[PDB]
Design a protein around this nucleic acid. Structure first.
Lengths: 138, 12, 21, 431, 22
RNA sequence: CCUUAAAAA
RNA sequence: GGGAUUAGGAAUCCCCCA
RNA sequence: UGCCAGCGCGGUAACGGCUUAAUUUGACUCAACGGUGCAUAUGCCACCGCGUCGCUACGUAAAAGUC
RNA sequence: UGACGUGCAAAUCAAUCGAACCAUCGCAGGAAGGUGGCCAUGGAAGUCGGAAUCCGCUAAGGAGUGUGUAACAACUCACCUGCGCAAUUAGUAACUAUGACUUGCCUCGUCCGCAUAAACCAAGAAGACCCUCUGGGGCGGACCACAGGGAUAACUGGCUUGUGGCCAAGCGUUCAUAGCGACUUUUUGAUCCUUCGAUGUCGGCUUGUUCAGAACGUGACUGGGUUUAGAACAGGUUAGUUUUAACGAGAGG
């Protein structure tokens, strides 16, 4: 019934929402748990880290954890070896080129909000996102 | 200055 | 020709009391 | 230099593991060797203790004491000269692992110097004397003015230390003088003036260093009147002038005068701790005065405030019965963490969730005060400790539960899932 | 009648005063 | 030249 | 600092005029 | 409960040694070189003798102090 | 420290002695998308810090110059379009400190003793002080007498201002300049120019004190500190002639 505009507040690489998100979120009116539970494992087990944004639509007086990434940090996703980094490890400069298929095969989800020319624009704009690589596709 | 007394010549 | 007269003063010093006619 | 602080945390872990340790009988042997004192004399007195231990009305206890003595003796031999910040030795034969008993020795060089002796071969380690070292005590630089130079000493709980000392010629009384003794008074005022200058500037070289305080003392101490013209002069100090404690008369003068200045500085230190307490709590009273609500108290909202942006001034009393015991199932089917108020400690209802009825098992003790100590820097702001000794402090305890803090800004009570997530996911943003 | 002077007097006293505090 | 505070009528 | 004597330590014995 | 809390009692029946994951352990003049010989096949778990100065308390008491 | 103080008086109410006397030698409109960039940070998403500073659209827009917010939000600027002639009196006790033991410099000490008619034409006065290779002398390298010197100090004043006094890294929760801020002679030194046949030197009108501008205001007032002889000293204590013509939550107000 009740619905409201999203706030997309997350900014963490952590699993299961906050360190203990399951309990504080409850209110006096009460609410029914959904995506906050096991569904996070679908995200943590596949799209871990990279501070993915989460829309809060609340379609039925309850939390709704959308799992879709925006951009920017997405360029980092193209790597096969992310076994944490703990803390204070010299900012861990993890980088090593990128797959040649960085084009529409990865950018297909990015098309929803970009506008302008396709091949002259949206496919080209992702190239500037890869400042973190420091080596380019070459 | 001659020394003496009585006479007025003294002190001259 | 004023008349000459003497008078005693401090520390035994003598000073004139001459008349002026 | 943060790694040295990590070493300090290691020293704290050593103090915890040390104090936790205990041993039956008088066999246990604590020891503390003072700075600037020969080790060999301590070896002689320890030998006298070995002679005292030569006759004991017990079997195993005799061999245990003598063995601890041989242990501290063999351990002592590695040193050749007295270590910096003194020496602190512990020895014994503690029992662990379901009554298993083993000999143990503990050595470390403290980050913070201490100047006291403490030999006491009785049960349980006497680490309380080291607890004063655990605090981040400020250096207490003390200036001891005199008519024949001045003594730039310091204090550090117990460790007195004279950073500098000197003597200078004094113009003194004009004496029989002459028709113009006043010019002699002018040269007197001039030498006194230079004494106000180059000496205090040398103090600027030896204390403030570089726009950062190294001392909280700067206590005056002089049999002569110079201290009265010291605090009352433009040439004195910037900012540091407010750090002055109280005048300290010295009947003998000199280093002995610095020695009386020690304990007198201790009582006036109690005084300025009183002002510091009344101020640190009084600013919180000023926060109470505002209708803006930029304040927090109790175990309730304050924790959620810690979850978000750090409180501008955390304020927590020492003793606190509440403990942060973890609520983690052995099957890990439901992680949980919550504060344990004493009524809940009696009820213990929270251990048994209605969802399954399983009771969470304890893993390791996690006291709330140490829980503040574990990573207060990570939480932002700075940790603070308040005593109940102040009259305002008792009001802080009985009137607020002994815990609270100054918020950077006002916070509303949570309500509905939207605002509740607006606060909680924001807490995640601050984490 | 003629002798002169010669004596400490009152005037001699200042001279005494001036040499007093050099 | 002296002798445990580290434990019995 | 390491031995020896003593039940064990000291000790002794082995290395400017205003 | 185990000189702690309490009422004369209460102190678990009121080769040496560093090192080492271990260097098993007992044994200190002659009379050393699983826990408890200070409960006794077994229970319980007496010469090695007897004022000054510095701390605390109201000359004395209270300490293991230094001569 | 009275009166007098060129007086009644060379001391009042052999006149000379630390070697006598005599003689001789602008306004309106656009200021935005990928993207809240990366990283650090409790948070800082133009405007805390670090690095980087690339482009789609387009008549404009920076990985943002200056305000603001905890941070956003918001308001603007770079750019863009339109309009009678005496006489001054080494090492150390089991908390620490300490240490058995092995007339006072500092000094205004607090509640193991540095060192027990006339004068005169400012006056009377050839300074009883200072001084007779040396930026005065001494050092380094005062019971006193006389002849002279501002050629050579101390009082003041003059010259000098070394001394003293009166751009903006940062502080100020945030923010450089609300308020602070690193890198003139009222002080003194120095000079000896003026004054040695004389310019009466201090303070005042609990410590004598200054302290806590006007010859270092004012002696043709005080003698307290200095202070010649009594008991060599910027070592102390004592007694010693001073002359003449509404607002704010409240508390507060």
């Amino acid at each position: 019934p009740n619905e409201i505009k999203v706030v997309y507040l997350r900014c963490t690489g952590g699993e299961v929402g906050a360190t203990s998100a399951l309990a504080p979120k409850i209110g006096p009116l009460g609410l029914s748990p959904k995506k906050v539970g096991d569904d996070i494992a679908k995200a943590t087990g596949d799209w871990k880290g990279l501070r993915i944004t989460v829309k809060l639509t609340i379609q039925n007086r309850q939390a709704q954890i959308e799992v879709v990434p925006s951009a920017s940090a997405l360029i980092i996703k193209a790597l096969k070896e992310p076994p944490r980094d703990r803390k204070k490890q010299k900012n861990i400069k993890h980088s090593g080129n990128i797959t040649f298929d960085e084009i529409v095969n990865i950018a297909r989800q990015m098309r929803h909000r970009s506008l302008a020319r396709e091949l002259s624009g949206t496919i080209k704009e992702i190239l500037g996102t890869a400042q973190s690589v420091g080596c380019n596709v070459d | 200055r001659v020394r003496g007394g009585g006479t007025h010549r003294s002190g001259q | 020709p004023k008349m000459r007269r003497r008078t005693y003063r401090a520390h035994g010093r003598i000073n004139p009391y001459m008349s002026s006619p | 230099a943060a790694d040295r602080n990590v070493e300090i945390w290691k020293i704290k872990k050593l103090i915890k593991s040390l104090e936790a340790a205990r041993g039956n009988g008088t066999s246990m042997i604590s020891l503390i060797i003072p700075p600037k004192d020969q080790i060999s004399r301590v070896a002689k007195m320890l030998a006298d203790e070995f002679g005292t231990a030569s006759n004991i009305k017990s079997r195993v206890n005799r061999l245990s004491v003598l063995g601890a003595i041989t242990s501290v003796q063999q351990r002592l031999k590695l040193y050749n000269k007295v270590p910096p910040n003194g020496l602190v030795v512990y020895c014994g034969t503690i029992v662990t692992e379901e009554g298993k008993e083993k000999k143990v020795n503990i050595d470390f060089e403290p980050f913070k110097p201490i100047n006291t002796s403490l030999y006491l071969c009785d049960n349980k380690f006497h680490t309380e004397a080291l607890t004063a070292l655990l605090s981040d005590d400020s250096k207490f630089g003390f200036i001891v003015i005199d008519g024949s130079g001045a003594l730039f000493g310091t204090l550090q709980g117990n460790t007195r230390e004279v950073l500098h000392k000197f003597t200078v010629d004094l113009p003194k009384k004009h004496g029989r003088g002459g028709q113009s003794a006043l010019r002699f008074a002018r040269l007197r005022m001039e030498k006194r003036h230079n004494y106000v200058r180059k000496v205090a500037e040398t103090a600027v070289q030896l204390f403030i260093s570089g726009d950062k305080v190294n001392v909280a003392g700067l206590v005056l101490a002089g049999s002569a009147d110079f201290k009265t013209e010291l605090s009352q002069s433009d040439m004195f100090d910037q900012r540091l002038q407010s750090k002055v404690l109280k005048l300290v008369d010295i009947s003998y003068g000199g280093e002995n005068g610095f020695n009386q200045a020690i304990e007198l500085s201790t009582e006036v230190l109690s005084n300025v701790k009183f002002i510091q307490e009344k101020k640190l709590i009084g600013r919180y009273f000023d926060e109470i005065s505002q209708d803006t609500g930029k304040y927090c108290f109790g175990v309730e909202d304050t924790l959620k405030a810690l979850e978000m942006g750090a409180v501008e001034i955390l304020i927590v009393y020492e003793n606190l019965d509440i403990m942060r015991y973890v609520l983690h199932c052995q099957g890990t089917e439901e992680e949980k963490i919550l504060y344990l108020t004493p009524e809940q400690e009696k009820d213990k209802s929270h251990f048994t969730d209605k969802e399954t009825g399983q009771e969470h098992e304890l893993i390791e003790s996690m006291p709330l005060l140490e829980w503040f100590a574990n990573n207060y820097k990570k939480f932002g702001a700075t940790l603070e400790i308040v005593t109940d000794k102040s009259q305002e402090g008792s009001q802080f305890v009985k009137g607020f539960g002994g815990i609270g803090g100054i918020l950077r800004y006002r916070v509303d009570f949570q309500g509905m899932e939207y605002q509740g997530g607006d606060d909680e996911f924001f807490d995640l943003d601050d984490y | 009648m003629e002798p002169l002077v010669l004596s400490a007097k009152k005037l001699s006293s200042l001279l005494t005063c001036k040499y007093i505090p050099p």
